[PDB]
Point group: C3
Chain length 341, copies 3
């Protein structure tokens, strides 16, 4: 970001990017992984930190998504939203605490493989308990275990109920945590969270139970110009799904999720990527097992410098044309050009 | 704010804050003063001023509210809006003039008690003629009476008609003004404004008449680490109300409004607050007298520095369970953590 | 704008303005050129550029419109939108390429007369193929013809299909280009673009054909404190129209468009303006010829400096009261005060 202020212990960055982005899929993209057409968007945000005393810092962050693929007519606001808005306090060797809209603690694990040029991170749904950005989350984090164990971190998070007007975007009270260890270029992590479901969620035809659960483990290697990561995750009554045939909606009673990525960064800027993502629903009403996501990725980002890049991301979709939920089976390739600051 | 530009007589500040905020009320908060659940939000704005010559400055300001308690789904924009957008000119000892969306001149008085950690300021409704932020307002202000009387200020404001698609947010043409005097830590102020009502407003079942009127007086003391203030106000056909029982809506034929606040700022950061707010509707159709607001406040803000604070604000709601308009009778307590720049 | 960052070859400007703005027209403005009432708005944007090496720069830009004439109620978002969002690369003497939401290439011509204090530029519709801002546009530009011919520029633009939920805001694939030559204070330009229409567009009662076409030529003189410009343009199946009598909608089978402007900039700040704009629809179903726009403009901007200005813009509307499409026939005058940075 661009440091717009640095005095008296307070630093503030404005940050953002403009992403010229286009998806190419068969026909109207209706049956594809990512869709088709212009997908241009921009981001803007601020990130501030104040040194309160030697041991205490305060911080806050806000981040917004502005779609650049809408007309200036009545659809102008489609897909626009606040991504993050939180504030907190960090006290040396004791931990940090923040509250607001922020990443759910299971993303402490899922973030490991969420590194593809355009796609990937498919199981880190927004407004989905602990796996993505979510509102009303209070998060305690500790780095290097009170300063005693270098590389050992943990987090505990309280998720406050959000009774919204859709089952998809709602949640009940919940709690979760994570622990990670980093060592010589490697990181390993485990995260788990459980929460009440709301009545509206329970009322949906797909998915059954009073609690939602999510956990994931991850390994990454991030050194020597290589980035390699693997996630496994499982969820109960937590992953949102829709049956396009019956026009029903709800949550998968269970999923088993696998994500893999490998990338290499050449000195001259090129960063090729390959990945695999498979999210498998189980015990789905009227169906049993059904794939939600299943693809191989081949892509590349070319970095001109830390402000400018382009990329192509090809998704070789393995979902078949007779997927029992109606999941699209066609490939999608994204091409993007990115200015960021 | 953060000064992002200062050359050739032009200074521009970017400013903002991230407010992690949660309300706690009985049950679903449906019958409470403030509601219940996550209430996180962020603000962003700019404020600019150009020195045109020795005697003339130009200025402009824009300010936005981004809710942080919405999902990234279809409710993403709920409660998002521009709070201020105006530009003006100030000519030494003659006065300033600005036009756009800005505070109505009666807020020159009501601002005195609008100082609680989270709540308070209940009668300074937005889009309500002269008491809060409102669109299309042209405002002339004079400080120290043409430079002749230190501490003596006055304002005159023309309110342009806003025919909106709700009675609640509309207004006709109007005019108002205020005068204030500050002396040795004290301020006293009086403000009055009157405006035409629109046909849509006249058509509502609650409230009757062709003119809306609002006035308020205020005293404050702001010195020696103390802040104490009192407002009295009266309105005619101006305060918006709803009868939850009859599902009718409109404006109170009259209100009488009292707001009191007392705060003390300790050197180490703590700023306790106590307050009282009672807004009383009179001659309401089918009812006569009915309280709209009636509570005692006890709260505190802890300031770490000028960038970081936390607060708790407890509203001891005195509205009774049989309030004839259906006003909520339950208490609400807010807890907030704030980073601002 | 305000340069918020300048290190390592990357420069970023934050920019914006607050425009206090009011329109005055007969009655409710329903039958006027511009409407009536408060029209205050604000703009915010960023514009970045990174020097990648001696010959290569990357850049990005985002720009937003925040209306300041809405209430903070349910109409809060009306007329808010992203105006621009794109990123690109410029390689010395070879050209630049950008993609995202940007000006259609025919605006390379229409921009010449789009210089009035408040109005004007009437044929540069947004989301209208090549004449205004539009989504999904890939644009190649060359300055000084590969460095061989000073003042000679050209552009080629690919317009990607946007199938939106309104005919008005949609378009099919298209291509266009422009060429301009500047010399001794003068500029001349020609621009043309053609694109497929979508099925939804073809389905509208007004307008008939599979292709939309737009072209325009322009001359400007911009020197010696004078600004004078002329545009001529023609369109096929491209200009959006509505018959208020039949409540039908679509596109004009053809238009012929003329825009003229002349302005002079006095040293002390005053910049008077006169203009003429006439857009004439032809072969309109059930009507034949009908004027869409037809007015003379007289106005002035007073510049205090590069940050602060005021203006008045008077539109002498020549549309007659029996216009066969229901186009408003009444005058409109805008008064504005502008702070910008
Ligand atoms: C002390 C550190 C705490 C780390 C807790 C997590 C341990 C597991 O390592 C996760 C490696 O990824 C494995 C992905 O397959 C998952 C199958 O169960
Ligand atoms: C870290 C990730 C490791 C994964 C290895 C990636 C290999 C790329 O996969 C190529 C599979 O092509 C199969 C083509 O099927 C098309 C059927 O319609
Ligand atoms: C020369 C300065 C002009 C000030 C005009 C206002 C005078 C009144 O003082 C306001 C003090 O608050 C009293 C609150 O009770 C109101 C009851 O009427
Ligand atoms: C500047 C303000 C001066 C106001 C003094 C504030 C005193 C705090 O009020 C405490 C009242 O408690 C009454 C409890 O009733 C509960 C009934 O459900
Ligand atoms: C080599 C430079 C290329 C320029 C191509 C455009 C040439 C025409 O000049 C445009 C002057 O405005 C005339 C407006 O009337 C239009 C009537 O046809
Ligand atoms: C560069 C532009 C050159 C155009 C010259 C502008 C002259 C201003 O026009 C004055 C026309 O007034 C006609 C009044 O009709 C009113 C009927 O309701
Ligand atoms: Mg279950
Ligand atoms: Mg009355
Ligand atoms: Mg035709
Ligand atoms: Na169910
Ligand atoms: Na009435
Ligand atoms: Na047609």
């Amino acid at each position: 970001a661009a440091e717009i202020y640095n005095k008296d212990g307070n630093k503030v960055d404005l940050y953002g990017k403009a992403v010229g982005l286009h998806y190419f899929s068969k026909g109207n993209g209706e049956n594809s992984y990512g869709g088709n057409g212009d997908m241009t968007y921009a981001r803007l945000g601020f990130k501030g930190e104040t040194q309160i005393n030697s041991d205490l810092t305060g911080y806050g962050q806000w981040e917004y998504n502005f779609q650049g693929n809408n007309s200036e007519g009545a659809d102008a606001q489609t897909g626009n939203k606040t991504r993050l808005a939180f504030a907190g306090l960090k006290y040396a060797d004791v931990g940090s605490f923040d509250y607001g809209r922020n990443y759910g603690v299971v993303y402490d694990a899922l973030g490991y493989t969420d590194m593809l040029p355009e796609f990937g991170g498919d199981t880190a749904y927004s407004d989905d308990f602990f796996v993505g950005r979510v509102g009303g989350v209070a998060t305690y984090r500790n780095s290097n275990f009170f300063g005693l164990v270098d590389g050992l971190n943990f987090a505990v998070q309280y998720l406050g109920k959000n009774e919204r007007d859709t089952a998809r975007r709602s949640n009940g009270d919940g709690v979760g945590g994570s622990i990670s260890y980093e060592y010589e270029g490697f990181g390993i992590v485990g995260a788990y969270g459980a929460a009440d479901r709301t009545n509206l969620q329970e009322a949906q035809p797909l998915g059954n139970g009073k609690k939602a659960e999510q956990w994931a483990t991850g390994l990454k290697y991030d050194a020597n110009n290589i980035y390699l990561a693997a996630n496994y995750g499982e969820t109960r009554n937590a992953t949102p799904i829709t049956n396009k045939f019956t026009n029903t909606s709800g949550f998968a009673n269970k999923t088993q999720d696998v994500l893999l990525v490998a990338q290499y960064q050449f000195d001259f800027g090129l960063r090729p990527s390959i990945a695999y993502t498979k999210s498998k629903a189980k015990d789905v009403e009227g169906i049993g097992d059904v794939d939600l996501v299943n693809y191989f990725e081949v892509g590349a980002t070319y970095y001109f410098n830390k402000n400018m890049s382009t990329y192509v991301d090809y998704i070789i979709n393995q979902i078949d044309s007779d997927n029992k939920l109606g999941v699209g089976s066609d490939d999608t390739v994204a091409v993007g050009i990115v200015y960021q600051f």
